[PDB]
Design an enzyme around this catalytic site. Structure first.
Site, PDB file in Angstrom:
ATOM      1  N   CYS A   1       6.884   2.072   0.259  1.00 51.03           N
ATOM      2  CA  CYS A   1       7.555   2.061   1.476  1.00 51.03           C
ATOM      3  C   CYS A   1       8.217   3.672   1.746  1.00 51.03           C
ATOM      4  O   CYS A   1       9.063   4.197   0.812  1.00 51.03           O
ATOM      5  CB  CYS A   1       8.856   1.296   1.553  1.00 51.03           C
ATOM      6  SG  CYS A   1       9.899   1.413   3.137  1.00 51.03           S
TER       7      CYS A   1
ATOM      8  N   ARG B   1      12.421   4.458   2.726  1.00 47.75           N
ATOM      9  CA  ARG B   1      13.432   4.033   1.934  1.00 47.75           C
ATOM     10  C   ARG B   1      14.648   4.679   1.857  1.00 47.75           C
ATOM     11  O   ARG B   1      15.668   4.254   1.097  1.00 47.75           O
ATOM     12  CB  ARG B   1      12.937   3.725   0.501  1.00 47.75           C
ATOM     13  CG  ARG B   1      12.037   2.494   0.154  1.00 47.75           C
ATOM     14  CD  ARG B   1      11.740   2.513  -1.114  1.00 47.75           C
ATOM     15  NE  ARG B   1      10.501   3.446  -1.329  1.00 47.75           N
ATOM     16  CZ  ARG B   1      10.203   3.828  -2.596  1.00 47.75           C
ATOM     17  NH1 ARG B   1      10.761   2.980  -3.754  1.00 47.75           N
ATOM     18  NH2 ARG B   1       9.317   4.612  -2.762  1.00 47.75           N
TER      19      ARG B   1
ATOM     20  N   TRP C   1      12.057   0.339  12.062  1.00 50.82           N
ATOM     21  CA  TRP C   1      11.445   1.102  13.119  1.00 50.82           C
ATOM     22  C   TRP C   1      10.102   1.702  12.770  1.00 50.82           C
ATOM     23  O   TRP C   1       9.884   2.016  11.454  1.00 50.82           O
ATOM     24  CB  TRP C   1      12.534   2.093  13.646  1.00 50.82           C
ATOM     25  CG  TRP C   1      13.088   2.984  12.710  1.00 50.82           C
ATOM     26  CD1 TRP C   1      12.400   4.351  12.301  1.00 50.82           C
ATOM     27  CD2 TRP C   1      14.270   2.928  12.175  1.00 50.82           C
ATOM     28  NE1 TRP C   1      13.429   4.867  11.546  1.00 50.82           N
ATOM     29  CE2 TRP C   1      14.537   4.015  11.352  1.00 50.82           C
ATOM     30  CE3 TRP C   1      15.421   2.064  12.356  1.00 50.82           C
ATOM     31  CZ2 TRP C   1      15.709   4.270  10.606  1.00 50.82           C
ATOM     32  CZ3 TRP C   1      16.562   2.312  11.792  1.00 50.82           C
ATOM     33  CH2 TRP C   1      16.697   3.313  10.671  1.00 50.82           C
TER      34      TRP C   1
ATOM     35  N   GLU D   1       1.607   4.496  12.305  1.00 46.12           N
ATOM     36  CA  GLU D   1       1.460   3.054  12.225  1.00 46.12           C
ATOM     37  C   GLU D   1       0.650   2.593  13.429  1.00 46.12           C
ATOM     38  O   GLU D   1      -0.151   1.839  13.370  1.00 46.12           O
ATOM     39  CB  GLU D   1       2.340   2.172  11.891  1.00 46.12           C
ATOM     40  CG  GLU D   1       3.360   2.752  10.617  1.00 46.12           C
ATOM     41  CD  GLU D   1       4.602   2.040  10.278  1.00 46.12           C
ATOM     42  OE1 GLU D   1       4.311   0.999   9.936  1.00 46.12           O
ATOM     43  OE2 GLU D   1       5.774   2.541  10.535  1.00 46.12           O
TER      44      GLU D   1
HETATM   45  C1  HEM Z   1      13.513   1.861   8.679  1.00 41.66           C
HETATM   46  C2  HEM Z   1      12.231   2.148   8.934  1.00 41.66           C
HETATM   47  C3  HEM Z   1      10.884   1.967   7.971  1.00 41.66           C
HETATM   48  C4  HEM Z   1       9.926   2.759   8.185  1.00 41.66           C
HETATM   49  C5  HEM Z   1       9.477   4.172   8.981  1.00 41.66           C
HETATM   50  C6  HEM Z   1       8.649   2.036   7.049  1.00 41.66           C
HETATM   51  C7  HEM Z   1       7.800   2.526   6.809  1.00 41.66           C
HETATM   52  C8  HEM Z   1       6.806   1.796   6.193  1.00 41.66           C
HETATM   53  C9  HEM Z   1       5.312   2.314   5.787  1.00 41.66           C
HETATM   54  C10 HEM Z   1       4.518   3.315   6.769  1.00 41.66           C
HETATM   55  C11 HEM Z   1       4.891   1.552   5.041  1.00 41.66           C
HETATM   56  C12 HEM Z   1       3.294   1.539   4.480  1.00 41.66           C
HETATM   57  C13 HEM Z   1       2.514   0.156   4.982  1.00 41.66           C
HETATM   58  C14 HEM Z   1       1.589   0.241   5.841  1.00 41.66           C
HETATM   59  O1  HEM Z   1       1.348   1.210   6.549  1.00 41.66           O
HETATM   60  O2  HEM Z   1       1.257  -0.669   6.685  1.00 41.66           O
HETATM   61  C15 HEM Z   1       5.996   0.529   4.606  1.00 41.66           C
HETATM   62  C16 HEM Z   1       5.545  -0.263   3.368  1.00 41.66           C
HETATM   63  C17 HEM Z   1       6.729  -1.183   3.057  1.00 41.66           C
HETATM   64  N1  HEM Z   1       8.218  -1.327   3.601  1.00 41.66           N
HETATM   65 FE1  HEM Z   1       8.916  -0.054   4.625  1.00 41.66          FE
HETATM   66  N2  HEM Z   1       9.535   0.982   6.525  1.00 41.66           N
HETATM   67  C18 HEM Z   1      10.702   0.822   7.035  1.00 41.66           C
HETATM   68  C19 HEM Z   1      11.822  -0.215   6.784  1.00 41.66           C
HETATM   69  C20 HEM Z   1      11.386  -1.101   5.841  1.00 41.66           C
HETATM   70  C21 HEM Z   1      12.460  -2.148   5.592  1.00 41.66           C
HETATM   71  C22 HEM Z   1      13.783  -2.209   6.461  1.00 41.66           C
HETATM   72  C23 HEM Z   1      12.019  -2.709   4.762  1.00 41.66           C
HETATM   73  C24 HEM Z   1      12.349  -4.140   4.019  1.00 41.66           C
HETATM   74  C25 HEM Z   1      13.677  -4.753   4.040  1.00 41.66           C
HETATM   75  C26 HEM Z   1      10.705  -2.326   3.972  1.00 41.66           C
HETATM   76  C27 HEM Z   1       9.778  -2.821   3.121  1.00 41.66           C
HETATM   77  C28 HEM Z   1       8.642  -2.180   2.886  1.00 41.66           C
HETATM   78  C29 HEM Z   1       7.695  -2.819   1.851  1.00 41.66           C
HETATM   79  C30 HEM Z   1       7.891  -3.741   0.660  1.00 41.66           C
HETATM   80  C31 HEM Z   1       6.632  -2.034   1.958  1.00 41.66           C
HETATM   81  C32 HEM Z   1       5.233  -2.428   1.008  1.00 41.66           C
HETATM   82  C33 HEM Z   1       4.145  -3.223   1.853  1.00 41.66           C
HETATM   83  C34 HEM Z   1       2.980  -3.644   0.655  1.00 41.66           C
HETATM   84  O3  HEM Z   1       3.641  -3.545  -0.652  1.00 41.66           O
HETATM   85  O4  HEM Z   1       1.853  -3.585   1.042  1.00 41.66           O
HETATM   86  N3  HEM Z   1      10.483  -1.159   5.026  1.00 41.66           N
HETATM   87  N4  HEM Z   1       6.934   0.794   5.147  1.00 41.66           N
HETATM   88  C1  LIG Z   2       9.906  -3.057   8.168  1.00 39.99           C
HETATM   89  C2  LIG Z   2       8.664  -1.845   8.483  1.00 39.99           C
HETATM   90  C3  LIG Z   2       8.905  -0.921   9.163  1.00 39.99           C
HETATM   91  C4  LIG Z   2       7.898   0.144   9.378  1.00 39.99           C
HETATM   92  N1  LIG Z   2       7.858   0.937   9.928  1.00 39.99           N
HETATM   93  N2  LIG Z   2       6.516  -0.477   9.304  1.00 39.99           N
HETATM   94  C5  LIG Z   2       6.441  -1.805   8.902  1.00 39.99           C
HETATM   95  C6  LIG Z   2       4.778  -2.515   8.901  1.00 39.99           C
HETATM   96  C7  LIG Z   2       4.225  -1.912   7.355  1.00 39.99           C
HETATM   97  C8  LIG Z   2       4.362  -2.965   6.457  1.00 39.99           C
HETATM   98  C9  LIG Z   2       5.340  -3.232   5.619  1.00 39.99           C
HETATM   99  C10 LIG Z   2       5.447  -4.175   4.794  1.00 39.99           C
HETATM  100  F1  LIG Z   2       6.624  -4.565   3.947  1.00 39.99           F
HETATM  101  C11 LIG Z   2       4.407  -4.873   4.485  1.00 39.99           C
HETATM  102  C12 LIG Z   2       3.401  -4.673   5.430  1.00 39.99           C
HETATM  103  C13 LIG Z   2       2.008  -5.717   5.367  1.00 39.99           C
HETATM  104  C14 LIG Z   2       0.787  -4.966   5.556  1.00 39.99           C
HETATM  105  C15 LIG Z   2      -0.230  -5.267   6.385  1.00 39.99           C
HETATM  106  C16 LIG Z   2      -1.520  -6.022   5.688  1.00 39.99           C
HETATM  107  C17 LIG Z   2      -2.684  -5.001   6.063  1.00 39.99           C
HETATM  108  F2  LIG Z   2      -2.810  -3.992   5.066  1.00 39.99           F
HETATM  109  C18 LIG Z   2      -2.202  -4.125   7.228  1.00 39.99           C
HETATM  110  N3  LIG Z   2      -0.808  -4.140   7.112  1.00 39.99           N
HETATM  111  C19 LIG Z   2       0.021  -4.340   8.575  1.00 39.99           C
HETATM  112  C20 LIG Z   2       3.138  -3.817   6.252  1.00 39.99           C
HETATM  113  C21 LIG Z   2       7.255  -2.450   8.529  1.00 39.99           C
END
Ligand code: HEM
Ligand SMILES: Cc1cc(N)nc(CCc2cc(F)cc(CC[C@@H]3C[C@H](F)CN3C)c2)c1
Ligand code: HEM
Ligand SMILES: Cc1cc(N)nc(CCc2cc(F)cc(CC[C@@H]3C[C@H](F)CN3C)c2)c1
Ligand SMILES: C[C@H](O)[C@H](O)[C@H]1CNc2nc(N)[nH]c(=O)c2N1
Ligand SMILES: C[C@H](O)[C@H](O)[C@H]1CNc2nc(N)[nH]c(=O)c2N1
Ligand SMILES: [Zn+2]
Lengths: 407, 411
Positions: free
Chosen positions: B108, B111, B280, B285
């Site tokens: 993430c 964070r 947000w 994305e």
């Molecule tokens: C506040 C703005 C936030 C932004 C801009 C953000 C952005 C992202 C991005 C770009 C990813 C990469 C996954 C993808 O591209 O599909 C990601 C993954 C992730 N986000 Fe954040 N996120 C935000 C908030 C949060 C919040 C509030 C949570 C949980 C309370 C969170 C938990 C996670 C987790 C657990 C992943 C890992 C997904 C995985 O293991 O496949 N994020 N986030």
């Molecule tokens: C809270 C938040 C903020 C932000 N800015 N963006 C997101 C979306 C990113 C994301 C976060 C997450 F915790 C799990 C997934 C699941 C991954 C899935 C599975 C596949 F790979 C394609 N993904 C869409 C995707 C969430």
């Protein structure tokens, strides 16, 4: 334990078994992944040779043949007496082609089997090294129709007679720290550009000054040689739409030729083994020109494009970055100098992966390095799972000579 | 045993000791790195150590380690486990655990905001209608008329695995995808399978290219039920381009609230199988993946056509050109409607500051380079040049199988 890799854009799944042949270590554990870290006697030698010779005679469908066991015994005998051994030419070519084949960070490996191998193991002096390198540069450049090549200098003996090319690449632009502040030329080469002058070089103190060669034969002090300019093919960088692009005064050289790595075949260490191919466009346009620790021309290109550089969210760096990389490809293609764009090279590599899983059972691949440094997810390698593991023969990093050489 | 990571752009070196507190496995071994692999039922036996480990962390953070409040809570959790086989988190522990699950999410980039999470306790919920209500309230709160606020809603924890709460949607707000008989796809190709389930469950599909999917909600292990989110709660942004007036005529729009709803939250050995969370968007994305992935809306062709690019050879980088314009459009549209969004340059720079702060006050920051680096212009962001250590800390967010593959149907 017969692992599988999914492509998430196509749902194609390959089964990897080659990884169980892996010998060296990755740096990772079950507790921590180091996938993004840049760099992690008579007895050890014979098993290394046996393993190499075993895979060699299998490759020629002569495993367990008289010739096989004879060569095994023959090398066994030479090691017990001489404490090293010499590769047959055939084994040397195979060892080198497979070092490239095994290079998990290399996207251009589909061409691995066409490598031209130059045996320079009869070399004794830096002037001799110079001559071999000049011949390599001319052969590989081929008037712009580039051709892959490696030249292999004598192997390490006791670590006091090492052959080393002190340049990181055979062709590289100089870099000079400025009295006022930053850096003129290539900042990545400032210390090497220093050591050249600090060893005798006369710097023209321009921006695109081709560095001299600094060659070390048999562990002696290194010597400076200027590569004949007629052998250094260079491309003036212009843009197909923006006529003011020429005014930037940019050019790059056509031949990427890595010269500071170590080639390991059958336990033997070839410390001087310069190899060359042809460029992927983004190596120059994304990294060389736009890294902040390099030529860092983004500000000026964006300026000349009159883009809104007030906020990052106008994506003006992204917009310039694309134009710069369009110009590099346009320039090379216009001058008929081989170059491949990242879309073509990564598609090629997906096809190469499919070939290796099919005809070999695997293909070690380092996602962090295979994915291009721009437009990553619109290329097929982004969605390709990859397994990273170390096979041998291999190219390995080695310390910079000046930190080591008993000067 | 200490470990160093180097930023090769700035030569900044940092020392990680936090990886020592790592328990779970990575998937890697000394002989293979699985760093690029996407995604590689608990008894009282192993539960009290997982609880004790969590409670030790909790009381350390409030500077009460070894206090009477700490030891009494250990003992109270002990007896409750051996007498009931599970245990209940105090409200303070739930908030701590969920913030730290986000903090530990190595993939993430967002964070830096982890301490600001708004946590909604939905552990008293019992029915799918109750879930719908909690989720509507989450969307309203988190959307905040465009001034987005991070939030998470936590439904009851797993008991015997036969009574799970699950949100069957992968995200609370997503567009339908419809496979046509001619082979083409209408709407979002990533949602075709889920869309088909909803239609099978009785959803009347409008069959447009941007149909907000219904919520499909499973309480206490019962069959899931369908609810339509009130449209006035679903904030959407029409996409236009600041220089290209024809861009609006592509008819594109996207929703403002990214809200992941199919992951498992693990705290002190307890498993929260329904824990939708939202933040947000980073602009890429939407503009890179959602619109330009070959397996999504895949508009590179039509955008490149309308830009009149040299589309014959790939070496004209028409694909890279269209991708940048599309991403300018997403950022311009969101900022113009005052819906929170962050560009990939801001987000990655913030993350570098976060990470350096985490190394200093926490001893490390687990980070997955493969996921942190943005999917366009990778190397002109500071994270490209940043070495990163990946390891698993708990509390954590985990993947779980899709519920339609495991669920036992009542009927
Ligand atoms: C506040 C703005 C936030 C932004 C801009 C953000 C952005 C992202 C991005 C770009 C990813 C990469 C996954 C993808 O591209 O599909 C990601 C993954 C992730 N986000 Fe954040 N996120 C935000 C908030 C949060 C919040 C509030 C949570 C949980 C309370 C969170 C938990 C996670 C987790 C657990 C992943 C890992 C997904 C995985 O293991 O496949 N994020 N986030
Ligand atoms: C809270 C938040 C903020 C932000 N800015 N963006 C997101 C979306 C990113 C994301 C976060 C997450 F915790 C799990 C997934 C699941 C991954 C899935 C599975 C596949 F790979 C394609 N993904 C869409 C995707 C969430
Ligand atoms: C012919 C076309 C070739 C292309 C397009 C190509 C491309 C690349 C690229 C883009 C990288 C990433 C490293 C970086 O960004 O600096 C790389 C790494 C590498 N290349 Fe290839 N290359 C080619 C030829 C060769 C040849 C002929 C050899 C050896 C005989 C070779 C050996 C390697 C090795 C060993 C690495 C990894 C270095 C490391 O481990 O850090 N390449 N290549
Ligand atoms: C033959 C060839 C073809 C091609 N197309 N490209 C190249 C250059 C790619 C490269 C390859 C290599 F084997 C080592 C380095 C050194 C990488 C440097 C060293 C430092 F560690 C960080 N990197 C900036 C760079 C070579
Ligand atoms: C194969 C590879 O792991 C997979 O495509 C990953 C790579 N990195 C990613 N990074 C982000 N942010 N999002 C993704 O979906 C992916 N996909
Ligand atoms: C920290 C990170 O490992 C480092 O910046 C790597 C990332 N990926 C790379 N990929 C390529 N092709 N070349 C590089 O120099 C790097 N550098
Ligand atoms: Zn790893």
């Amino acid at each position: 334990r017969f692992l599988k890799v999914k492509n998430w854009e196509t749902d194609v799944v390959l089964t990897d078994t080659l990884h169980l042949k892996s010998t060296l270590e990755t740096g990772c554990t079950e507790h921590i992944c180091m996938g993004s870290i840049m760099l992690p006697t008579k007895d050890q030698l014979f098993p290394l040779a046996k393993e190499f010779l075993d895979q060699y005679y299998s490759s020629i469908k002569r495993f367990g043949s008289k010739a096989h066991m004879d060569r095994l015994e023959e090398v066994n005998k030479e090691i017990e007496s001489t404490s090293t051994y010499q590769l047959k030419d055939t084994e040397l070519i195979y060892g080198a082609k497979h070092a490239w084949r095994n290079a998990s960070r290399c996207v251009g490996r589909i061409q691995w089997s066409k490598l031209q191998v130059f045996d320079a193991r009869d070399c004794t002096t830096a002037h001799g090294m110079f001559n071999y390198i000049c011949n390599h540069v001319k052969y590989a450049t081929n008037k712009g129709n580039l051709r892959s090549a490696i030249t292999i200098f004598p192997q390490r003996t006791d670590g006091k007679h090492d052959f080393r090319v002190w340049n990181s690449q055979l062709i590289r632009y100089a870099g000079y720290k400025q009295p006022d502040g930053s850096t003129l030329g290539d900042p990545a080469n400032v210390q090497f550009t220093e050591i050249c002058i600090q060893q005798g070089w006369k710097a023209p103190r321009g921006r695109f000054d081709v560095l001299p060669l600094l060659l070390q034969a048999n562990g002696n002090d290194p010597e400076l040689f200027q590569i004949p300019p007629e052998l250094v093919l260079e491309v003036p960088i212009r843009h197909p739409k923006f006529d003011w692009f020429k005014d930037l005064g940019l050019k790059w050289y056509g031949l990427p030729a890595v010269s500071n790595m170590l080639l390991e075949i059958g336990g033997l260490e070839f410390s001087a083994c310069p190899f060359s191919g042809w460029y992927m466009g983004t190596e120059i346009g994304v990294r060389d020109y736009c890294d902040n620790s390099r030529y860092n021309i983004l500000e000026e290109v964006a300026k000349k494009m009159d883009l809104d550089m007030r906020k990052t969210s106008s994506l003006w760096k992204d917009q310039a970055l694309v134009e710069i990389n369009i110009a590099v490809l346009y320039s090379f293609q216009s001058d008929k100098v081989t170059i491949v764009d990242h879309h073509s090279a990564t598609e090629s590599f997906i096809k190469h992966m499919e070939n290796e899983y099919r005809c070999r059972g695997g293909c070690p691949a380092d996602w962090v390095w295979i994915v291009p440094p721009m437009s990553g997810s619109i290329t097929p390698v982004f969605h390709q799972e990859m397994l990273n593991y170390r096979l041998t023969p291999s190219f390995e990093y080695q310390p910079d000579p000046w930190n080591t050489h008993v000067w």
